[PDB]
Coordinates of C-alpha atoms and ligand atoms in Angstrom, one line a residue:
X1 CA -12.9 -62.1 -41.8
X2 CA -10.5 -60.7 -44.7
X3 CA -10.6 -58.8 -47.9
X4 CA -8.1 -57.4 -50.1
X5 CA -7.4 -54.0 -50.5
X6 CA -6.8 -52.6 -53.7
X7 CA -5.6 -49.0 -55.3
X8 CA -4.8 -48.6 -58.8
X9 CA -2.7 -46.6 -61.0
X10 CA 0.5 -48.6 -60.4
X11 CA 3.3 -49.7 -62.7
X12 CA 4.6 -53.1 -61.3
X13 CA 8.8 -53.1 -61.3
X14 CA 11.2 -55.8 -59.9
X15 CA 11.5 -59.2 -58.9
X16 CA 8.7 -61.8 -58.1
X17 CA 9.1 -65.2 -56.8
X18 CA 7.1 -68.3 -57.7
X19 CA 6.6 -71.3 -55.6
X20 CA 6.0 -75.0 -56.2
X21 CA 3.3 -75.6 -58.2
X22 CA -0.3 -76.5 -56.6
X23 CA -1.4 -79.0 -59.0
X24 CA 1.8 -80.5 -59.0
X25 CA 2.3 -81.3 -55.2
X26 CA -1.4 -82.8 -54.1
X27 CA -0.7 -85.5 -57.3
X28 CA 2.5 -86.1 -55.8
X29 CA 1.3 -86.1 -52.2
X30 CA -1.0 -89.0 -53.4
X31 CA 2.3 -90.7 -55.6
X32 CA 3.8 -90.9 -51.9
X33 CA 1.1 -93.4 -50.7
X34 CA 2.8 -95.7 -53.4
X35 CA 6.3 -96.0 -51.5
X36 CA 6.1 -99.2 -49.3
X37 CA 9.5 -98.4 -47.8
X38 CA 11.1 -95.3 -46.6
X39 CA 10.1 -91.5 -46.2
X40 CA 9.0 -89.4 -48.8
X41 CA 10.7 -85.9 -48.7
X42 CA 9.4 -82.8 -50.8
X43 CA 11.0 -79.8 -51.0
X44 CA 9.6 -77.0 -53.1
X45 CA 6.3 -77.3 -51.2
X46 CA 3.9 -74.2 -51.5
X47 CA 2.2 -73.0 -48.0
X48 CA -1.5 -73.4 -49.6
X49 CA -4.7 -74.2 -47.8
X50 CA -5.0 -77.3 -50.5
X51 CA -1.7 -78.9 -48.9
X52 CA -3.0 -78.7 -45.5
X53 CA -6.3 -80.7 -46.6
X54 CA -4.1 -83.0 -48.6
X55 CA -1.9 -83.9 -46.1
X56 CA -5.1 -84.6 -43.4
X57 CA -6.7 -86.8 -46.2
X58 CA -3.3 -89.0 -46.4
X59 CA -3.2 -89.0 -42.7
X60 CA -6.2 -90.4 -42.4
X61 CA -4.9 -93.0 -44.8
X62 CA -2.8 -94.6 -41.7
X63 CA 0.5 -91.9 -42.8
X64 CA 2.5 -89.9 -41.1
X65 CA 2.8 -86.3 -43.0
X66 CA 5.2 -83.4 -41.8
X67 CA 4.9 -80.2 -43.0
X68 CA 7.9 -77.7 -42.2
X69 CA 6.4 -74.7 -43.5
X70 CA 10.1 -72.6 -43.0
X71 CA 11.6 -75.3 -45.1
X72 CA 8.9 -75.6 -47.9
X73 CA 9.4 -79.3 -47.1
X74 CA 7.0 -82.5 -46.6
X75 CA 8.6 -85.5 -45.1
X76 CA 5.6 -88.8 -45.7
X77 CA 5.9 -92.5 -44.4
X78 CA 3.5 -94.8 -45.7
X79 CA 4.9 -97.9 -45.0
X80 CA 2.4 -99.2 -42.6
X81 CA -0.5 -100.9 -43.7
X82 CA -2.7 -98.2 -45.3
X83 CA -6.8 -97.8 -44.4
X84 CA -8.7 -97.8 -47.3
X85 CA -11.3 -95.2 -46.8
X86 CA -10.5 -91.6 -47.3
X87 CA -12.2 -89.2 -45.0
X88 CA -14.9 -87.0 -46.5
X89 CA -14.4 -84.0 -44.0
X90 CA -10.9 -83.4 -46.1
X91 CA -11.6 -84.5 -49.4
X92 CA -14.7 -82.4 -50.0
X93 CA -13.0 -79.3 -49.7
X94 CA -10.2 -79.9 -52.5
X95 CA -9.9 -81.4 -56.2
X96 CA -7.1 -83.8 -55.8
X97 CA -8.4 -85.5 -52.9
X98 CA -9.6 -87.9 -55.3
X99 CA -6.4 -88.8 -56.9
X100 CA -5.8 -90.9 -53.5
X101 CA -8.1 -93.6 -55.2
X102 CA -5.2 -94.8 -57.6
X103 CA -2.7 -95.7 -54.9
X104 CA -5.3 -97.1 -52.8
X105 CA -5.8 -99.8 -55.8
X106 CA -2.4 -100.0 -56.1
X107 CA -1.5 -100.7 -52.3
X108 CA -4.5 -102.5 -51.3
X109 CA -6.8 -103.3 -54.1
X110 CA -9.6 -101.6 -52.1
X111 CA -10.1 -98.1 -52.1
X112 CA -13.4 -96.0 -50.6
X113 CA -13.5 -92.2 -51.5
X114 CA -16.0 -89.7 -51.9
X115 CA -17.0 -87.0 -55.0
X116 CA -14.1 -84.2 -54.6
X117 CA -15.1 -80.7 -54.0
X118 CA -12.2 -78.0 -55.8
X119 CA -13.3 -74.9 -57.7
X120 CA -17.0 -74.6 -58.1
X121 CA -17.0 -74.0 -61.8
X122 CA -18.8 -77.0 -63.5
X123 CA -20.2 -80.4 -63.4
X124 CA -16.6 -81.6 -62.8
X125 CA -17.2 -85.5 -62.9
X126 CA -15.2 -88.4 -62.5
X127 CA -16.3 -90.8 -64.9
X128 CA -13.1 -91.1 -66.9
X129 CA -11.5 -92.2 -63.4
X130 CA -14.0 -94.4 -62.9
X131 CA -13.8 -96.3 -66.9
X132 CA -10.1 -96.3 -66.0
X133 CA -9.9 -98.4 -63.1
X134 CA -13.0 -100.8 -64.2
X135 CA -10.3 -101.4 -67.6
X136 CA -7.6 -102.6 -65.1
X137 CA -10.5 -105.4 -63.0
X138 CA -11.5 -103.0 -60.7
X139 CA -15.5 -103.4 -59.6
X140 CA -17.0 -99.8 -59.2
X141 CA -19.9 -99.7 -56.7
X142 CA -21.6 -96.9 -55.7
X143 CA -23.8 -97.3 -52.0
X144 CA -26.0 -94.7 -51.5
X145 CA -23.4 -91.6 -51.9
X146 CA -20.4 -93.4 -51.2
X147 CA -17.5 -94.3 -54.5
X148 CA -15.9 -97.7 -53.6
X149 CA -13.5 -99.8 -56.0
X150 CA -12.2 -103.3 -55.3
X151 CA -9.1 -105.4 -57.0
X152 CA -8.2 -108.8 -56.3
X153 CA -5.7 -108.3 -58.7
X154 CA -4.9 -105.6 -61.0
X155 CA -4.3 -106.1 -65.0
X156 CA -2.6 -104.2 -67.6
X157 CA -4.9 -103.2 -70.5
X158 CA -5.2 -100.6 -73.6
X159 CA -7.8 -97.9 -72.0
X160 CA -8.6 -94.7 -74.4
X161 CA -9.5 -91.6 -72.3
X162 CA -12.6 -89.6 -74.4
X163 CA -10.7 -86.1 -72.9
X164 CA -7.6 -85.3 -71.9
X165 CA -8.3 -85.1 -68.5
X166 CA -5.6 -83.8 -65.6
X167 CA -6.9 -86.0 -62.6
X168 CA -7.9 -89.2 -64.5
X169 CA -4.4 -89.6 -66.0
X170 CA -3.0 -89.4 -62.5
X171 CA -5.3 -91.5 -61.1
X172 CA -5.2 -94.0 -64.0
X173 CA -1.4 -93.7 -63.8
X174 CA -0.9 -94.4 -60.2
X175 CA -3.1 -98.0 -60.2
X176 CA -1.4 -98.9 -63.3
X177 CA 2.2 -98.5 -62.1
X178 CA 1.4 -101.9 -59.6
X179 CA -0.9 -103.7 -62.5
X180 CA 0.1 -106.7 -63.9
X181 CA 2.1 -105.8 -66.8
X182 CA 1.9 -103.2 -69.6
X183 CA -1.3 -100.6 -69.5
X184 CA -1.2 -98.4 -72.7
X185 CA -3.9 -95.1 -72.1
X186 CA -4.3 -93.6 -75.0
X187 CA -5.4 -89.7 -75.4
X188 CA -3.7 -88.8 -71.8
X189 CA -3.7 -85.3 -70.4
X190 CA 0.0 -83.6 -71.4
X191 CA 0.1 -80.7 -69.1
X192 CA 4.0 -81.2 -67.4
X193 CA 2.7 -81.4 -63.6
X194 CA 1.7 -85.1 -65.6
X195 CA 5.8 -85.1 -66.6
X196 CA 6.5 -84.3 -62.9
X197 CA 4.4 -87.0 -61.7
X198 CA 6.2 -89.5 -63.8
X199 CA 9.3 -88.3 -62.6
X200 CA 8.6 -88.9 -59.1
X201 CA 7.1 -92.1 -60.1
X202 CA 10.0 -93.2 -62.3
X203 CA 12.3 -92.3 -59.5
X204 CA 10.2 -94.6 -56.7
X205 CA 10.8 -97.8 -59.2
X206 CA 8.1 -97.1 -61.9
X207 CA 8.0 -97.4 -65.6
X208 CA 5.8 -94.8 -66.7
X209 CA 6.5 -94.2 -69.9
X210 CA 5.6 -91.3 -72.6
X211 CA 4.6 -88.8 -70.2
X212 CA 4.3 -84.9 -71.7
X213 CA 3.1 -87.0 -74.9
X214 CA -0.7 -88.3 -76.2
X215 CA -0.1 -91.6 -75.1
X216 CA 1.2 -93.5 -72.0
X217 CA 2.8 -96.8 -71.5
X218 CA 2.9 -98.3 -68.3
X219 CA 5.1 -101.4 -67.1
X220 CA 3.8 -102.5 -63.7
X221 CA 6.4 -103.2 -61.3
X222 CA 6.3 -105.4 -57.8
X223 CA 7.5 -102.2 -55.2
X224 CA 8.3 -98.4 -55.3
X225 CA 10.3 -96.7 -52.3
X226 CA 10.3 -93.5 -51.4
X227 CA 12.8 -90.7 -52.8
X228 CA 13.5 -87.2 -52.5
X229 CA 11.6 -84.9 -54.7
X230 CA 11.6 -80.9 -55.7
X231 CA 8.4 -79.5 -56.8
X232 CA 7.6 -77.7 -60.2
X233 CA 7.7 -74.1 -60.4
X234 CA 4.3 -73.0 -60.1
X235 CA 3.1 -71.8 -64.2
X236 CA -0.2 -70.4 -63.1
X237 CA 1.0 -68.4 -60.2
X238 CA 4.0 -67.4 -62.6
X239 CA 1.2 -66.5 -65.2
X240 CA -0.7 -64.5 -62.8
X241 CA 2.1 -62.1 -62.5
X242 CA 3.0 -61.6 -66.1
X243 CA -0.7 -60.7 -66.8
X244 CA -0.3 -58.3 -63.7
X245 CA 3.0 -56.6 -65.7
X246 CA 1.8 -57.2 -68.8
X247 CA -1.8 -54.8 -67.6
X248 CA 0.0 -52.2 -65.3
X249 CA 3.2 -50.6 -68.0
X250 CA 5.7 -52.9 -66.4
X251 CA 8.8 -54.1 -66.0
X252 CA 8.9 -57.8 -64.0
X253 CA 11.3 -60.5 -64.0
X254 CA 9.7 -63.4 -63.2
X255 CA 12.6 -65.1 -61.2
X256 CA 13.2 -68.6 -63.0
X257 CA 9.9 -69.3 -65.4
X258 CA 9.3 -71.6 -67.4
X259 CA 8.9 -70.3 -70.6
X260 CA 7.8 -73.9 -72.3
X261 CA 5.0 -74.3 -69.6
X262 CA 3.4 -70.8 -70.7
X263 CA 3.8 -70.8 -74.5
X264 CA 0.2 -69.6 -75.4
X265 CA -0.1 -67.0 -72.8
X266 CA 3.4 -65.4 -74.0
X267 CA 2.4 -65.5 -77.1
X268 CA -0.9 -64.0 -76.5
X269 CA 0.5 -61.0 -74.1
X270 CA 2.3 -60.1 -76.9
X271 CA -0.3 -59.9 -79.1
X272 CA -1.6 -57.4 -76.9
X273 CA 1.7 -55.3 -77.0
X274 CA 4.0 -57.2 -74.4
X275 CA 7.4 -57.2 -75.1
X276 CA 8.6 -60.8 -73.2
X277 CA 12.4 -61.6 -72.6
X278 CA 13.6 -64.6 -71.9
X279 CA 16.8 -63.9 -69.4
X280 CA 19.2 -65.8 -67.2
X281 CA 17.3 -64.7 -64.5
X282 CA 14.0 -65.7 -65.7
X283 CA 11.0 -64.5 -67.8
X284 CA 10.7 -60.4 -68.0
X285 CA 7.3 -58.9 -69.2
X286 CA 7.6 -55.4 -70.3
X287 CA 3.2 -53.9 -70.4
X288 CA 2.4 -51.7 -73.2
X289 CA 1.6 -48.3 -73.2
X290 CA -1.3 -49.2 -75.5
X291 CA -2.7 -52.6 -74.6
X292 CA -4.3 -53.8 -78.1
X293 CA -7.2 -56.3 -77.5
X294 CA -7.0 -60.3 -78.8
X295 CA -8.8 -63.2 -78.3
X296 CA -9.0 -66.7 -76.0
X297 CA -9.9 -69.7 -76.4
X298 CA -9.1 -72.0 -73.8
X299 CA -8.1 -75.7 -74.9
X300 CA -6.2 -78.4 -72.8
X301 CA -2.5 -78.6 -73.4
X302 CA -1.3 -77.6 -76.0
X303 CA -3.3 -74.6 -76.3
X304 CA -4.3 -71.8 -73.5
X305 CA -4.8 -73.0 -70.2
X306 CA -8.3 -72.7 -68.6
X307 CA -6.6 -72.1 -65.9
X308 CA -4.9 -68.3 -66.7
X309 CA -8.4 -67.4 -68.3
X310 CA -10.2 -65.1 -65.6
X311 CA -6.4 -63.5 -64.9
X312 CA -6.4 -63.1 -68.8
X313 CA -9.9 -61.5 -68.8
X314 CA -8.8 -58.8 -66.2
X315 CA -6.3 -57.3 -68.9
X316 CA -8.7 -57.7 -72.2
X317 CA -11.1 -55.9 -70.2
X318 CA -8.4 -52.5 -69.9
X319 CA -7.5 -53.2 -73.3
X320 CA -8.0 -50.4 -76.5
X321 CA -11.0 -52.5 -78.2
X322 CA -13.7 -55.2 -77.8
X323 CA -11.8 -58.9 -77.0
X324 CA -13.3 -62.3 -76.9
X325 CA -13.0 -65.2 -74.7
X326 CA -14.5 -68.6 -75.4
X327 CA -14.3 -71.5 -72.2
X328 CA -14.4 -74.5 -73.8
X329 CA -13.2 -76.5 -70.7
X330 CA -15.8 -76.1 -67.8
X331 CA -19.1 -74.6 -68.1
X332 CA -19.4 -72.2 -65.3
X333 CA -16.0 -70.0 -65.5
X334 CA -17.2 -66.9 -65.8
X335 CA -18.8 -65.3 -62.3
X336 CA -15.7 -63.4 -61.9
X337 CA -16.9 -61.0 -65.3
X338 CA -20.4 -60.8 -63.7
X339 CA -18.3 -59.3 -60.2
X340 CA -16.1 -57.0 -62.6
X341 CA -19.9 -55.6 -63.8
X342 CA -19.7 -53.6 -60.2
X343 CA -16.5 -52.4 -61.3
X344 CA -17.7 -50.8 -64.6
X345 CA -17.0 -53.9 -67.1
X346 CA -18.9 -53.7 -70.3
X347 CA -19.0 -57.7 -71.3
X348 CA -21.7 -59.5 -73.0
X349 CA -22.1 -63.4 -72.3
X350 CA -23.9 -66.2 -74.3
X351 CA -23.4 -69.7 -73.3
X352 CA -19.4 -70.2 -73.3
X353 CA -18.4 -67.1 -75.0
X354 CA -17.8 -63.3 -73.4
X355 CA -17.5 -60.1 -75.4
X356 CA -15.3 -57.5 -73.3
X357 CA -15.6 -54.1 -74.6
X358 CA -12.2 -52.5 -73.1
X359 CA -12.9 -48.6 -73.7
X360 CA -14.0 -48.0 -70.1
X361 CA -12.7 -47.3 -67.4
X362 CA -12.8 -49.7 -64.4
X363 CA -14.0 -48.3 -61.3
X364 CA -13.1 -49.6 -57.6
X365 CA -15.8 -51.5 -55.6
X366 CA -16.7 -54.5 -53.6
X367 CA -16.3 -57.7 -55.0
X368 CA -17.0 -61.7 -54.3
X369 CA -14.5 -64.2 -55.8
X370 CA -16.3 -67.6 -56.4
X371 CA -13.4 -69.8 -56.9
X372 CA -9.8 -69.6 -57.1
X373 CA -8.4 -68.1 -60.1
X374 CA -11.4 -65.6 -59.9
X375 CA -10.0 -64.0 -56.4
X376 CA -6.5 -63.5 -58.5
X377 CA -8.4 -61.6 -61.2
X378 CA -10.4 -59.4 -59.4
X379 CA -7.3 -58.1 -57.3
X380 CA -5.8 -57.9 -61.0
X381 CA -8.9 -55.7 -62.4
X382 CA -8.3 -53.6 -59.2
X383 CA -4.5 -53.0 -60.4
X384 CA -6.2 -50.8 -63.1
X385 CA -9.5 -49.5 -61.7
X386 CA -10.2 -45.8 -60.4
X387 CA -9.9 -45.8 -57.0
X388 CA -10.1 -48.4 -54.2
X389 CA -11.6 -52.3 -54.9
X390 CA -12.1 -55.1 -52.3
X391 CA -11.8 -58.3 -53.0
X392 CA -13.8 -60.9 -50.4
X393 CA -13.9 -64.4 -50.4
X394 CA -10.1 -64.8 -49.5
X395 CA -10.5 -68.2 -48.8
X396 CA -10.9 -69.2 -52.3
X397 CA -7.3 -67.3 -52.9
X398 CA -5.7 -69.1 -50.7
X399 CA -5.9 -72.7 -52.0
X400 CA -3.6 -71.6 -55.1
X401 CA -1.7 -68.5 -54.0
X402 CA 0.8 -67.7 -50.6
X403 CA 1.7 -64.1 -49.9
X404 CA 0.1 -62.9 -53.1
X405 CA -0.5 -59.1 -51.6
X406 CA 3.1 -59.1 -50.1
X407 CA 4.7 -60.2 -53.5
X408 CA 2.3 -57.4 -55.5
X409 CA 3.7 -55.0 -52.9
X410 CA 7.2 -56.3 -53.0
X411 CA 6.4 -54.7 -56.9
X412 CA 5.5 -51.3 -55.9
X413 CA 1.3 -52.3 -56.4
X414 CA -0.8 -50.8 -53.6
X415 CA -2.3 -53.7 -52.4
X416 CA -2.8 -54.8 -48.8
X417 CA -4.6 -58.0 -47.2
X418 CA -6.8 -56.2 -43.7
X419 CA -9.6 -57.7 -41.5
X420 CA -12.9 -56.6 -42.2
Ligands
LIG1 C1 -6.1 -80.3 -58.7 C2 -5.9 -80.0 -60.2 O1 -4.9 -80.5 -60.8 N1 -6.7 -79.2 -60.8 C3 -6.6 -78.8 -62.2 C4 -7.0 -80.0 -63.1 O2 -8.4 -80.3 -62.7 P1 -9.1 -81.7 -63.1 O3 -8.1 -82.8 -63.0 O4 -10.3 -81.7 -62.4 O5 -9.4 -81.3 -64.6 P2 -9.8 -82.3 -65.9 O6 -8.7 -82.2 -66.9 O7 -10.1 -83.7 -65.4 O8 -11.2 -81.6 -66.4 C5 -11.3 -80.9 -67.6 C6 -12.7 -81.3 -68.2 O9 -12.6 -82.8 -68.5 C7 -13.9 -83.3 -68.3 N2 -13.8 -84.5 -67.4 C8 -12.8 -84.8 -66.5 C9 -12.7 -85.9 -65.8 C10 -13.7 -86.9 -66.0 O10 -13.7 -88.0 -65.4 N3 -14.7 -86.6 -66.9 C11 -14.8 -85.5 -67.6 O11 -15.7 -85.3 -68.5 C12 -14.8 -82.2 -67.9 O12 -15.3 -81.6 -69.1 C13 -13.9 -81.3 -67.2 O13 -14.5 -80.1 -67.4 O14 -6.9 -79.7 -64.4 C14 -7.8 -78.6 -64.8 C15 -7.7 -78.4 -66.3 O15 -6.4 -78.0 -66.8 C16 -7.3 -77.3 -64.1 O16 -8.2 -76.3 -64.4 C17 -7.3 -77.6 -62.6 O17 -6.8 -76.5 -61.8
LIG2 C1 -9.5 -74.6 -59.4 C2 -9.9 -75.2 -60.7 C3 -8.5 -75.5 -58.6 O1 -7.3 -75.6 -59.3 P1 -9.1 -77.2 -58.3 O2 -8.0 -77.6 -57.3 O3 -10.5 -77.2 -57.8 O4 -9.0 -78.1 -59.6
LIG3 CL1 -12.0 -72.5 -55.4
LIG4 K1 -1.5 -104.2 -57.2
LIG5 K1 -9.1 -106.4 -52.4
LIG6 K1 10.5 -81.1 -60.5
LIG7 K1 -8.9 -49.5 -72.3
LIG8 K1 -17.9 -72.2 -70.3
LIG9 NA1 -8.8 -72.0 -48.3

């Protein structure tokens, strides 16, 4: 139905906006199935397809869910008696969907929810959610398809996660806050929407403890209630536009960052000639003249996020010299360099590493995004392409980023979002 429409040869100058982080709210959406009593109210919410299918997988749950899309603002009441089964319809279509499971447990000792859909850029199992919730007494059975746990009671034990991982922290966080006594998980994700979770949680009656660190200690408590909550800034959508600044010679406040949240990617867009402020007003990113090329490797917390790599590939592929990227998080992240190929990329890939050879000149054309973050970069390789680039697929954009052509306009960038 829609495509974006793209002319380069911009600078980018003024004042951007960030809202609410995605991967902040659907953890938290989930957290508000823990309050027994009261209504939940979020403020800060972003208007992103993944709230919308969030907030129909909870309501499925026996919830009522309000979205006030004027007010960025959620009001949830979960204090009936909550169904146990999660409906596929809505949870195939998103990540976090599955994150439901751990309140479920917590609530009922019985939860029934399929494999999660998201981005389609690896094997992306579940596994680590699975060993968690087995560690507490939960049975794991598996009919035909379907994911079902069951706990007459949960327990408090030492459980060592073999990555990092985002979702299985959350989900391993949210049945331990109603175990039976102290859980310990050892090796837990860091990113900070984890430190935002715990917040929320903390607030509702919780004892998480040692969030934002390698290891968690849990206290399981009786009841949480409901409280009112502000999301996150957004650091990937915040990200997205330093890279666009950072690639265009320009001049952007970035109205309240986060600096802490995006350490490696400030430090990184000033290896490539940035100059980066940090202001009362927020984070400014002044682009070079001459962008110098640098390398990526993408890590989980605390190195560079898999998540501003693609965005990050659009300006080592404009700049003076041959950069290198290396995925090492999911193994199927790079269909967005194979779409920049129409635009005139030269890049070379082997298994989890791509070779960008920057002394070319991109040239406008038609492109697919495959996934989120993929959609942002190609509109970002059209910032500095020859002529006009479309970027289809739209519906992959939209799960991460609201008004994204009317906040790169809002920055003097030609860019416009038109039916096709
Ligand atoms: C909705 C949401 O918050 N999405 C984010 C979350 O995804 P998500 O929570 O899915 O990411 P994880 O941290 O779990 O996945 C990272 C890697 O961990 C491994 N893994 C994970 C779980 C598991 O049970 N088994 C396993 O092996 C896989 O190698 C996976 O490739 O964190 C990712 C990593 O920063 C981000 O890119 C996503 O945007
Ligand atoms: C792309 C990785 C998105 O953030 P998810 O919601 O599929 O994790
Ligand atoms: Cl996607
Ligand atoms: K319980
Ligand atoms: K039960
Ligand atoms: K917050
Ligand atoms: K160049
Ligand atoms: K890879
Ligand atoms: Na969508």
């Amino acid at each position: 139905m829609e495509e974006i429409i793209v002319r380069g040869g911009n600078q980018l100058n003024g004042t951007v906006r960030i809202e609410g982080a995605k991967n902040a709210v659907l953890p938290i959406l989930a957290a508000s199935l823990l309050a027994e009593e009261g209504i939940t109210t979020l403020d800060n919410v972003p208007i992103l397809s993944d709230v919308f299918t969030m907030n129909q997988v909870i309501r499925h749950l026996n919830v009522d869910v309000d979205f006030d899309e004027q007010k960025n603002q959620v009001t949830i009441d979960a204090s009936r008696q909550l169904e146990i089964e999660a409906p596929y319809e809505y949870v195939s279509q998103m990540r976090a969907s599955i994150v439901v499971m751990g309140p479920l447990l917590a609530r009922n000792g019985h939860a029934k929810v399929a494999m999660p859909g998201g981005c389609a850029i690896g094997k992306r199992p579940i596994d680590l959610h699975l060993k968690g919730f087995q560690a507490l007494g939960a049975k794991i059975i598996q009919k035909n398809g379907y994911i079902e746990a069951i706990a007459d009671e949960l327990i408090g034990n030492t459980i060592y996660l073999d990555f990092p991982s985002v979702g299985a922290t959350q989900n391993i966080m949210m049945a331990a806050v109603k175990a039976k006594g102290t859980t310990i998980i050892e090796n837990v994700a860091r990113e900070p929407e984890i430190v935002d979770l715990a917040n929320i949680l903390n607030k509702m009656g919780a004892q998480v403890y040692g969030a934002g660190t390698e290891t968690m200690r849990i206290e399981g408590v009786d009841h949480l209630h409901a409280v009112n909550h502000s999301i996150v800034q957004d650091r990937i959508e915040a990200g997205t536009f330093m890279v666009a600044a950072a690639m265009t010679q320009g001049n952007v406040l970035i109205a309240d960052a986060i600096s802490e949240h995006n350490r490696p990617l400030i430090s990184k867009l000033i290896e490539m000639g940035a100059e980066i402020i940090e202001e009362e007003g927020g984070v400014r990113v002044i682009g070079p003249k001459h962008i110098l090329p640098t390398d990526v490797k993408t890590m989980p917390h605390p190195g560079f996020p898999t998540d501003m790599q693609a965005q990050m590939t659009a300006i080592q592929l404009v700049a003076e010299g041959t950069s290198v990227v290396t995925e090492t998080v999911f193994e199927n992240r790079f269909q967005h360099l194979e779409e920049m190929r129409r635009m005139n990329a030269h890049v070379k890939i082997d298994g989890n590493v791509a070779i960008m050879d920057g002394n070319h000149e991109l040239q406008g054309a038609e492109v697919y995004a495959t996934d989120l973050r993929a959609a942002a970069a190609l509109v970002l390789a059209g910032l500095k392409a020859n002529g006009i680039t479309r970027v289809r697929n739209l519906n992959y954009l939209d799960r991460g980023y609201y008004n994204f052509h009317i906040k790169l306009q809002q920055l003097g960038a030609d860019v416009e979002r038109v039916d096709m």
